[PDB]
Amino acid sequence: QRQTQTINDSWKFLKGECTAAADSAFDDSKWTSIHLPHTWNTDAYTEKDYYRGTGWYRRQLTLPQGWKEKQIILRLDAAGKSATIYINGKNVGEHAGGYTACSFNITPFLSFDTPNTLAVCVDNARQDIAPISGDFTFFGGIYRDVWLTAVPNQHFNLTNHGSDGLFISTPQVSEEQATLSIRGEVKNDAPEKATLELTHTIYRPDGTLLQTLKKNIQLKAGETYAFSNEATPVLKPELWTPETPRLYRVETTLRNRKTKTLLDQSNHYTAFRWFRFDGDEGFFLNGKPYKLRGICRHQDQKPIGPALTAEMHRRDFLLMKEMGANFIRISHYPQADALLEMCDKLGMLAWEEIPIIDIVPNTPGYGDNCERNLREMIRQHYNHPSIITWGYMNEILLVTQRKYKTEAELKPVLERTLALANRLERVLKEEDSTRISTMAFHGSNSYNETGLSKITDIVGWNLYQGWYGGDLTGFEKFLAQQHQNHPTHPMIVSEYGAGSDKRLHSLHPRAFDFSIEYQQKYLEHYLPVLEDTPYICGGTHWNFIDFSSALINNKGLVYADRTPKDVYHYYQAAWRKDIPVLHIASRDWTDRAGVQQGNAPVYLPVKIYTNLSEVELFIDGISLGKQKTENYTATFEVPFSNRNPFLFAQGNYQGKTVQDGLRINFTPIPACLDANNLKGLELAVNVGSQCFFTSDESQLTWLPDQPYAAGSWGYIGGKEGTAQTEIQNTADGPLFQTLRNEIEGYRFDAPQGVYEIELLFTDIFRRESTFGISINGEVVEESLSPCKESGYFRALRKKYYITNDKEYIDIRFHSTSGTCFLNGIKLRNIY
Amino acid sequence: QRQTQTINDSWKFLKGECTAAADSAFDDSKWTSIHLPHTWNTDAYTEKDYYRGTGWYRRQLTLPQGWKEKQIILRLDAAGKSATIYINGKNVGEHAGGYTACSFNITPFLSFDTPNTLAVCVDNARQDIAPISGDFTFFGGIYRDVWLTAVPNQHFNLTNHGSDGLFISTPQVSEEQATLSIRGEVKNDAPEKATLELTHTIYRPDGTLLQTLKKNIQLKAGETYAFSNEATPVLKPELWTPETPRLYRVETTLRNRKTKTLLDQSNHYTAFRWFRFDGDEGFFLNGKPYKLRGICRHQDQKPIGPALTAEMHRRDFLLMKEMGANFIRISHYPQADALLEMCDKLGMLAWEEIPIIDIVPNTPGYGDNCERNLREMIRQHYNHPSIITWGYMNEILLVTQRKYKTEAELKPVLERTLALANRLERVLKEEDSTRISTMAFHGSNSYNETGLSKITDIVGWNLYQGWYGGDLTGFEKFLAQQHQNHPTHPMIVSEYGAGSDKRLHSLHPRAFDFSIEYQQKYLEHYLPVLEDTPYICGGTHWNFIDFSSALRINNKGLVYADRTPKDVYHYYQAAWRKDIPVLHIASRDWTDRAGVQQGNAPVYLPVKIYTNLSEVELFIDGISLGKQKTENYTATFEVPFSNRNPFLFAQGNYQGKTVQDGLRINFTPIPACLDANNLKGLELAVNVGSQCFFTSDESQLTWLPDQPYAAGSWGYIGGKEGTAQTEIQNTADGPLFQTLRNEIEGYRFDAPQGVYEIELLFTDIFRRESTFGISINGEVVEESLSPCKESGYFRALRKKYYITNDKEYIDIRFHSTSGTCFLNGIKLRNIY
Numbered sequence A: 001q002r003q004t005q006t007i008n009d010s011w012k013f014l015k016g017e018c019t020a021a022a023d024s025a026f027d028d029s030k031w032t033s034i035h036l037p038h039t040w041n042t043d044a045y046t047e048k049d050y051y052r053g054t055g056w057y058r059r060q061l062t063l064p065q066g067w068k069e070k071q072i073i074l075r076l077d078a079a080g081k082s083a084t085i086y087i088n089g090k091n092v093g094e095h096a097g098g099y100t101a102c103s104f105n106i107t108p109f110l111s112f113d114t115p116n117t118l119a120v121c122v123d124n125a126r127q128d129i130a131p132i133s134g135d136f137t138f139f140g141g142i143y144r145d146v147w148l149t150a151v152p153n154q155h156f157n158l159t160n161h162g163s164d165g166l167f168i169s170t171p172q173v174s175e176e177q178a179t180l181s182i183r184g185e186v187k188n189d190a191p192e193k194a195t196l197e198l199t200h201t202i203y204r205p206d207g208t209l210l211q212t213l214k215k216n217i218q219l220k221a222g223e224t225y226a227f228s229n230e231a232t233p234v235l236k237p238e239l240w241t242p243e244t245p246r247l248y249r250v251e252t253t254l255r256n257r258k259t260k261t262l263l264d265q266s267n268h269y270t271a272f273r274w275f276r277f278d279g280d281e282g283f284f285l286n287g288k289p290y291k292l293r294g295i296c297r298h299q300d301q302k303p304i305g306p307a308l309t310a311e312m313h314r315r316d317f318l319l320m321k322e323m324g325a326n327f328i329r330i331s332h333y334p335q336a337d338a339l340l341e342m343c344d345k346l347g348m349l350a351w352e353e354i355p356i357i358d359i360v361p362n363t364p365g366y367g368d369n370c371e372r373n374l375r376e377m378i379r380q381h382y383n384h385p386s387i388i389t390w391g392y393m394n395e396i397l398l399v400t401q402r403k404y405k406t407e408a409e410l411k412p413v414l415e416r417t418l419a420l421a422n423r424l425e426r427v428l429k430e431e432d433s434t435r436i437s438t439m440a441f442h443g444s445n446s447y448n449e450t451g452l453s454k455i456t457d458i459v460g461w462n463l464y465q466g467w468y469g470g471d472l473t474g475f476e477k478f479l480a481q482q483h484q485n486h487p488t489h490p491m492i493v494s495e496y497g498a499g500s501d502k503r504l505h506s507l508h509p510r511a512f513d514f515s516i517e518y519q520q521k522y523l524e525h526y527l528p529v530l531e532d533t534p535y536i537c538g539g540t541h542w543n544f545i546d547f548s549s550a551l552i553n554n555k556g557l558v559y560a561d562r563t564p565k566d567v568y569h570y571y572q573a574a575w576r577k578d579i580p581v582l583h584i585a586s587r588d589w590t591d592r593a594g595v596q597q598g599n600a601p602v603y604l605p606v607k608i609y610t611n612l613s614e615v616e617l618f619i620d621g622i623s624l625g626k627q628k629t630e631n632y633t634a635t636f637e638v639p640f641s642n643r644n645p646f647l648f649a650q651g652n653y654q655g656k657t658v659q660d661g662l663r664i665n666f667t668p669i670p671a672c673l674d675a676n677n678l679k680g681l682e683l684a685v686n687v688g689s690q691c692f693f694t695s696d697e698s699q700l701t702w703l704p705d706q707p708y709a710a711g712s713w714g715y716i717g718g719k720e721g722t723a724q725t726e727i728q729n730t731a732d733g734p735l736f737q738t739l740r741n742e743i744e745g746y747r748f749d750a751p752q753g754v755y756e757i758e759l760l761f762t763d764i765f766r767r768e769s770t771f772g773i774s775i776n777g778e779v780v781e782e783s784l785s786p787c788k789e790s791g792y793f794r795a796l797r798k799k800y801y802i803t804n805d806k807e808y809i810d811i812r813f814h815s816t817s818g819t820c821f822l823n824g825i826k827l828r829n830i831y
Numbered sequence B: 001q002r003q004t005q006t007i008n009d010s011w012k013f014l015k016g017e018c019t020a021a022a023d024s025a026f027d028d029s030k031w032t033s034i035h036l037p038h039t040w041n042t043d044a045y046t047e048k049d050y051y052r053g054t055g056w057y058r059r060q061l062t063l064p065q066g067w068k069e070k071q072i073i074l075r076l077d078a079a080g081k082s083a084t085i086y087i088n089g090k091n092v093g094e095h096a097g098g099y100t101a102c103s104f105n106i107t108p109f110l111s112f113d114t115p116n117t118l119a120v121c122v123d124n125a126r127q128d129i130a131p132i133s134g135d136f137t138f139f140g141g142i143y144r145d146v147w148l149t150a151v152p153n154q155h156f157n158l159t160n161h162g163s164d165g166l167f168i169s170t171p172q173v174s175e176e177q178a179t180l181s182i183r184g185e186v187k188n189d190a191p192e193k194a195t196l197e198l199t200h201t202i203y204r205p206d207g208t209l210l211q212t213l214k215k216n217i218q219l220k221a222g223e224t225y226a227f228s229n230e231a232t233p234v235l236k237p238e239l240w241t242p243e244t245p246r247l248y249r250v251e252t253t254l255r256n257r258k259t260k261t262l263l264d265q266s267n268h269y270t271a272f273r274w275f276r277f278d279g280d281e282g283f284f285l286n287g288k289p290y291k292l293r294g295i296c297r298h299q300d301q302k303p304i305g306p307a308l309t310a311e312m313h314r315r316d317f318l319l320m321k322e323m324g325a326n327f328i329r330i331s332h333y334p335q336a337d338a339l340l341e342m343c344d345k346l347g348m349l350a351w352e353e354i355p356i357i358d359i360v361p362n363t364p365g366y367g368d369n370c371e372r373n374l375r376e377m378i379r380q381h382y383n384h385p386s387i388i389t390w391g392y393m394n395e396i397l398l399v400t401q402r403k404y405k406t407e408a409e410l411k412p413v414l415e416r417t418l419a420l421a422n423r424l425e426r427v428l429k430e431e432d433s434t435r436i437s438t439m440a441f442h443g444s445n446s447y448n449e450t451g452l453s454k455i456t457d458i459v460g461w462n463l464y465q466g467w468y469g470g471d472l473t474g475f476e477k478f479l480a481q482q483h484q485n486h487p488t489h490p491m492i493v494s495e496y497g498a499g500s501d502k503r504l505h506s507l508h509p510r511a512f513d514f515s516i517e518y519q520q521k522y523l524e525h526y527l528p529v530l531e532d533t534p535y536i537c538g539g540t541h542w543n544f545i546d547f548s549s550a551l552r553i554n555n556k557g558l559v560y561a562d563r564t565p566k567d568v569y570h571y572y573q574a575a576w577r578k579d580i581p582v583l584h585i586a587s588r589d590w591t592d593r594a595g596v597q598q599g600n601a602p603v604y605l606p607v608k609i610y611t612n613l614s615e616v617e618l619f620i621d622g623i624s625l626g627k628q629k630t631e632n633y634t635a636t637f638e639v640p641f642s643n644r645n646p647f648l649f650a651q652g653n654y655q656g657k658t659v660q661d662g663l664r665i666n667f668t669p670i671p672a673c674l675d676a677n678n679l680k681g682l683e684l685a686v687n688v689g690s691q692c693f694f695t696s697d698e699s700q701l702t703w704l705p706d707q708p709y710a711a712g713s714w715g716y717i718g719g720k721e722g723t724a725q726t727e728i729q730n731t732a733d734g735p736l737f738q739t740l741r742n743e744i745e746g747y748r749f750d751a752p753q754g755v756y757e758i759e760l761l762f763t764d765i766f767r768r769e770s771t772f773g774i775s776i777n778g779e780v781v782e783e784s785l786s787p788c789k790e791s792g793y794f795r796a797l798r799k800k801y802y803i804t805n806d807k808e809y810i811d812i813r814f815h816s817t818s819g820t821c822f823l824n825g826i827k828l829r830n831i832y
Ligand code: NA
Pocket: A686, A687, A688, A689, A734, A735, A736, A737, A738, A739, A822, A823, A824
């Protein structure tokens, strides 16, 4: 019978090409001891010292005696970008693509006397294998399990594109009666004939047997046999939705028939479900209408050790289901098997796609390798009922439109692109005609004007109105105009979202400030549009989780360490009717600070996400009133005063009482500096920005810029300036990324003493900008030119010890070349 | 007038030896662009590729025109471990000491018409500059600010051991009156003669002027003038304590006697306080009993970028001060100045020490460089009122007694050591008779036999009874013993604590499981002994914050490295604050709960409460669990966990007001008796051989503590518990693999028929090599598995098998061949 285990242990690994490291006689003593899954560049210095090259994986296989008359199948669940397999120095085969599995019958190349050498030649630098752009162009390693399967010589075909060789489909489904079709290949690898018996046992969702199918066959030696057995129509079927995921086990045993011995066995689930996308009326599931409540999802495990990302795939999914999503868009996800299994068993419709993104260049064999990835994805995941559609292209004109302008420049690229698109579109339905095809566009109409939208069953629009330029209400406007022009093209919003930093907070949120509060606004707008519009089949939000790459990736709902952002609970409130949701949406904001008048309490908004009709918010036991909820949200102006306040909210749902609680930190900052309130104070201002930044260098909260008023402090002159480049030499990137430009001076009305002043600059204007600085009429810097000394986009921090013998600190800026700017200022009383 | 700024920007750097890197013409185009501070080696392996040697720092100096007449003093607040500085290829000077400052008058080497090149050679592999052992042996870089100061040609001495040049101290302090002595050195770097006015103004804590002192002085060219000005005795002085930190500012101004023009100006705080240490009655502060509630502290900041570690020193202090601490014990702290400024102003007593530790080597120059460092430390901090005692050694016998075991190879090292101890004790009292001296020992009576404890004014014991062996009561017993044999040695417990890991929790915590709960058991035993024992002056806990080192147990702190307090932080806060209400549900350390559940009966797990309220009431999801009266500032509730997202809520009455705390956590129930339905989406994982829950950082699974097999359930068969303390290769989930069931016979789950994924976890930890097979219901999956031969000792193996169960149970059997069978963890989950 059949036996499957992992060989993930006791590997040696050498980063670099090497002189037949496939040889069994090799000295791998000084290579690195590694344990698979193994991910290559888990240390990011950008392009410089990010490894693009060939690596070598080596492990000894000492075989078990119980396998000497058994075929041995070696499978690699995923290995990117491409690997070649050496048993004992000999080439068994290669693979191209780091998101599908591959498998090789390695029985010939193996002896049972001396230990065998398994060597793998992996390469992440291959521009002829998708993806060719984006964060995963160089995703390298054997970053998934590796399996040794042993079977009798009469087995199912485990070398059909890395799949199970089995394919269960349902050719007709209705509420009353559905048909089943079980297909696959059997392979005789013994040197003679064989008379066998093929059984199909079909179980109900409750465990009991429903139907048995026996059929029996003969096979000349070496023969591979193609079976295809219909089944008795299932009467009154148990139908499958993400809310009701009823699965029928299909056990497929293979018996010797002279002796009724069991040989090989292979279980698979299937389920009964039908669906259609209507261009006017939306999605339908089992006859009944249904909103796709989706999120996108690709490889995004956090690096937790040397060459080792996390393995949280499963508990990640629990977090999607408890948010109440019913749809997942999958791409760049190695061993997506693991994810779809839970999409089947726990409930979540799915699309998956091979990753052909951004541009179709003239790279030889790109097209050929892409069609193979498309076939592999479909065959390896055929038997998942959660999968209702296969894609293959994502924003395929995005880089083309940046790189080619004249229609004489685009004609050879568009020809090439429509060509690969149609090619893969036929491969798709040649491989599986029981699912819908889709293609995701970026927000331009040239996916219509070039023909790419007439190819696929349905179409995805990646819309970022209100993020990458534009206004929030152009989201509905873009979709409306798309449904007016092309009403037969049923639409999904396959990507939307806005990035956010836990470090950033605003009371006046605008796009590209990266504040928690703006992503909350942007998603508070989009989510009703997706639900209350009928001709929108639903959406898939930008990748569920935040992630980083050396080569903007913070638009998710869950932080990289798997804590949900506050806004997670906004979806949960809107998508889970079954349980009460009550979230004080201030986990993202436990380090609060504001400017205070004398002893007048400070008011900062505290938001609440709930699905309760009304909710009460208390602080230190003092009811702040009741508030009716609209769009699952409610905002209180909370009077922060005391330093360790305690927020508490409650309300009612379905008879019972629902509560939440949370402790935060609040620090007040004086509006008018006298000498009591200056002591132990570090007054830090995020010049030229409207955001509270909370520092990782210092854990100080750098306050928003405010204009100088008599008795107080603030800026004099200038206008807000923003840049979006990586600022080097600091962890506090965002503080340097916003300045006040054409600044005249900065002033604090502060008593006499000795003060430490820090000033923060970064030149972001690639005549050069040079200026002088003075304090209380005495020159501390005669000519400061941030770009000649640091360079553009590096960071400067200058600290000055100042002896103030006036009643104010008047810092002022002296234009010489270009413009005066200030990126941050910090004041500190010393004496 | 005095102008002082940083030259931290615009540096190029090169990791390794280079020649002509000092010269101004040199090409540093292809060098690394950096901003100071700059810490070396923010990357973790040990002796391999953690850098040891020379490194070069380059910057261009554009001297302003209005500075042409002035003197230029260059101050490096700290460089580790050694720095040599070049101005335009010319060697200005040298420093030896990773923790003190250095200063140089660079006026003669600078050009005012061209640009200058500032060039610094840093060497961290210096086996003659303390510390020569421990986590800071190779701490390297210019990891503190670098400054340019420009003064007129008559100024205060900026080049006396890299200090301010001024020295203020109170010769007599009492309730009735005190005296104030202001000393310093005025420097004339002109070629002429100068006639000057020197003024000291003394301000009251409230800011008003108490007094002015003028004195005319005359200096030849190139002269250093040592002044020493008494002040009018201060009547009814405002006394300083950590709870009342009144400071008198002293402004020292240098004027030209003719034109009354301001030349230099140096502000300092002084303060009036006195103290003693008694062998019987402990510590006294302004004549009252005072118990030292202390914490240790050294360089602490987490890496936050390439070569860049945080500068959270001032926020790290508010944490110490809000816990209620009144004492801090400082060492391996570069530019401690910033810390002691908080001590002075916000209120906390300090002791400081240069880092001589572990062994005194036979190293030419070491003793000399230590003396030079002790002086630097005292002169740079002489004016900090909060400093009450200086120290220089710390377990100076620890490594000596390990490496050497015969009294012949011991005799030279013990001579070398008392020799250096006396030298430094002489130097200390020479530099500062205003402050008591101290030494920190490890827990061995050898410091009394050798006579090391007859040297300093007080002694400190670094005691870990209950952690490194013994049991918690050996603590008070050790001190009880010490006080009785040397009663004239006043005692501070100068270090204590116990390591902990947020990932681990136990209901029966024993030393070295690293469970959060043992650390609380340990600190709940120690703190009362510290308060209630008279002859103990106080304690200083282990380093306030967890920290990782890249060399060769670094988690005994009260605060995690992300600067979040552990839960036991509030045990200290409740015992040490009386001003504010403290009421903390001790469960931030434990928000991923899980446990074994009978049917649907609720799973009882403990929830501890730290507070200084007299009685607390705990609710879960709104259901009161009833009030509890609090003792030793703690209350435990046995809580019934049901729902998967409970809401804990406590309340009580402090000072007639109401006090509340609340917290949402997570609970996963795991079924004791499996069936075809509770396996649906289950992942049953067992920390085999441990009695501890382990929440994983790979998966987020909470691996349940081992239970033995009982019919209808699951569990182990056979074998003893076994534990290890080496770290483990190839996994983030270390503690999982550090405990196993040794000589295990098997593991059995009673589960239905079906297809199951079984994952087994091994690490051989026993230097024939063990080998065994593994059968699951009679099928042989591993035929000859040997973790040590295949992988290695202390490497992880994760084997994973797909198996088809036709019995009503999964009976895993271990079949020995050589050595013993063992299992560090097992995880099952149903596929079909
Ligand atoms: Na800014």
